[PDB]
Protein: Ribonuclease T
Amino acid sequence: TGLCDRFRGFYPVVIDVETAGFNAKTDALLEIAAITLKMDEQGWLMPDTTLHFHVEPFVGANLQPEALAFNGIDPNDPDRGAVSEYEALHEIFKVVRKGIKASGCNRAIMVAHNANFDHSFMMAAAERASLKRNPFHPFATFDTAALAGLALGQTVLSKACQTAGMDFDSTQAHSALYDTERTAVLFCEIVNRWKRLGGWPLSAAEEV
Amino acid sequence: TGLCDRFRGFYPVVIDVETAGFNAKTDALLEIAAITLKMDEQGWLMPDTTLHFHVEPFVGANLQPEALAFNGIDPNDPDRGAVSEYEALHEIFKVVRKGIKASGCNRAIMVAHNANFDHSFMMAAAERASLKRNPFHPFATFDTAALAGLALGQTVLSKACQTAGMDFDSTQAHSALYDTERTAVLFCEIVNRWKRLGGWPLSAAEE
Ligand SMILES: [Co+2]
Ligand SMILES: [Mg+2]
Ligand SMILES: [Mg+2]
Structure:
């Protein structure tokens, strides 16, 4: 049916984040990717709009060396094409509000791998940027680590995609955009496979 | 069909908490329940061991009157048979570790509704109590809100249970033990139906 019927009004948005640490309050946000979803007329789920940004560290932001050493990001590189947290989120929020309205959903829910990590950073940044009318649910998320745990028996993203028959280039694992895309395809695959096997809608199982 | 094979070695333990606020760092833990799971020979999932505790507020803990008014808990009632965070968690960890070894798993993962909330409160209590060798994964969880969203198109615990054909008594919604048992049955129902519809194991579909 309609996307608005699938998750009780929740407009699922796949989000990934790269950072300069583990602490959403103190550490900088360096990258964020966003992929909205849409359902065709037969009720199949698929990626809709894709956004991605290199993000400037907020003034007073801490930068953990090990974080940089891990994700390989150097915030001081002038060729980053980085934008402010406000600019990135404002563009993502705009697209999301559009989708919510167009789809007849009541609000957005973040889809992410170990979602709380990405949720905490995005929400913190939005707060720093004084963003109004944050379309996202304040604490609800769709953790694909848990979903993949159920659907595929794997909780690590790369193994989940592999087990799902998807490609995964560890070469791009530190890229917010790449992770977001793989996670969007993964999530869509998990949901669609549920419908395919007659798990959805709930009346399908008996109508045979 | 082994539990240790179902979630790449993760030992799913259902957990629910009742609190005196929204902040895990500052607010008191008041209730905690724990339900380990087990798989039969055919690989069906079901509740195993059940634990439940009323918890003493750690000394120096804040207590939001809004929270107390909501959950109906009176931490000052001497008849609530409370125990320290150490007592409670130490007992759960003991039971959990035994389950992990007996099932051949390697680590425990918390199963909770909006799991981050309970995870953060349990982990914070564990730190306050200086518990050693916490068997739970430090950030991974199985949020039943998201799983029910997938399996049942519902994210609210009560509505998710109803949609799944389970009973839900609002009268008991403020009890950690009750929420934990309902959530455990929900999680099992979700895992079991995925298997029964041919979703698991992965090879089943082509058989
Ligand atoms: Co660059
Ligand atoms: Mg990530
Ligand atoms: Mg709860």
About this structure: Chain A has one domain: 1-208. The longest helix of chain A spans residues 176-196.
